[PDB]
């Protein structure tokens, strides 16, 4: 039998995205954050192309298609960055981009050291849990469907159906080489715990970027127009509790 679902996820996975950072200049808070913001915008372009090509994504109302991307991009990007960090440098540094790698000095200079260490821990877990490339792909897709509005989406039913199907695919990937139900259960527990761990990190980053945008003119940090829009219009909905992550565990 052909692994149709996984074939698609591998086929649509975005390639390498560079930040455009000048590594020849001494590190500075303004330059590092301005580059992270530019990287955010560049990756968002790829996240949109990727999301729109996901199995069943078109089943969603168009307004919901746009909403889920605008609410989940932080978690999606952090998860992918953690995977890059693990695969490329064994979690020794945060591999935001080939031209924007953070050692501890840069983590400190960025003024979000605590968040960076939590992301480094996330990266390490990909190794400790022996996450396979296929589990990574399925989990990342699930992250796109893990944050929704309290007031409900345009067509909440279509979204619930799609999320359920992605969870089913994750079950299938776990069962592939596991014949015992207990072994599958243990793996599902591990993976859902890992997925949940992305949310608190994403919220801390949402808070940090929101505060940074508000005082950006005072610290010389540049925000691309689109990022400024999303962080001032969508992110506050999350921070004010109107849009919340779907946790597997409490």
């Amino acid at each position: 039998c052909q692994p149709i679902f996984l074939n698609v996820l591998e086929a649509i996975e975005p390639g390498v995205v560079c930040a455009g950072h000048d590594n020849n200049q001494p590190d500075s808070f303004a330059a590092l954050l301005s580059s992270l913001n530019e990287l955010g915008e560049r990756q968002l372009v790829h996240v949109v192309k990727w999301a729109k090509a996901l199995p069943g994504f078109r089943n969603l109302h168009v307004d919901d298609q746009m909403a889920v991307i605008q609410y989940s991009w932080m978690g999606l990007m952090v998860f992918a960055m953690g995977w890059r960090s693990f695969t490329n440098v064994n979690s020794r540094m945060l591999y935001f981009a080939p031209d924007l790698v953070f050692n501890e000095y840069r983590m400190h200079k960025s003024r979000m050291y605590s968040q960076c260490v939590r992301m480094r821990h996330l990266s390490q877990e990909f190794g400790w849990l022996q996450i396979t490339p296929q589990e990574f792909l399925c989990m990342k897709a699930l992250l796109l469907f893990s944050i929704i509005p309290v007031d409900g989406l345009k067509n909440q039913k279509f979204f619930d159906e799609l999320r359920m199907n992605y969870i089913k695919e994750l079950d299938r990937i776990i069962a592939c080489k596991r014949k015992n139900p207990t072994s599958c259960s243990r793996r599902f527990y591990q993976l859902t715990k890992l997925l949940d761990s992305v949310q608190p990190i994403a919220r801390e980053l949402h808070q940090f970027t929101f505060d940074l945008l508000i005082k950006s003119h005072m610290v010389s940090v540049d925000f691309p127009e689109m990022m400024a829009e999303i962080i001032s219009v969508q992110v506050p909905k999350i921070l004010s509790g109107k849009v919340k992550p779907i946790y597997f565990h409490t």
């Binding site: 968002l44 372009v45 949109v48 729109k52 991307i69 127009e225 829009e229 999303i230 969508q234």
Partner: peptide
């Protein structure tokens, strides 16, 4: 929003 919507639309 507008900027994102335009991106999303292509």
């Amino acid at each position: 929003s507008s900027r994102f919507e335009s991106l999303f639309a292509g």
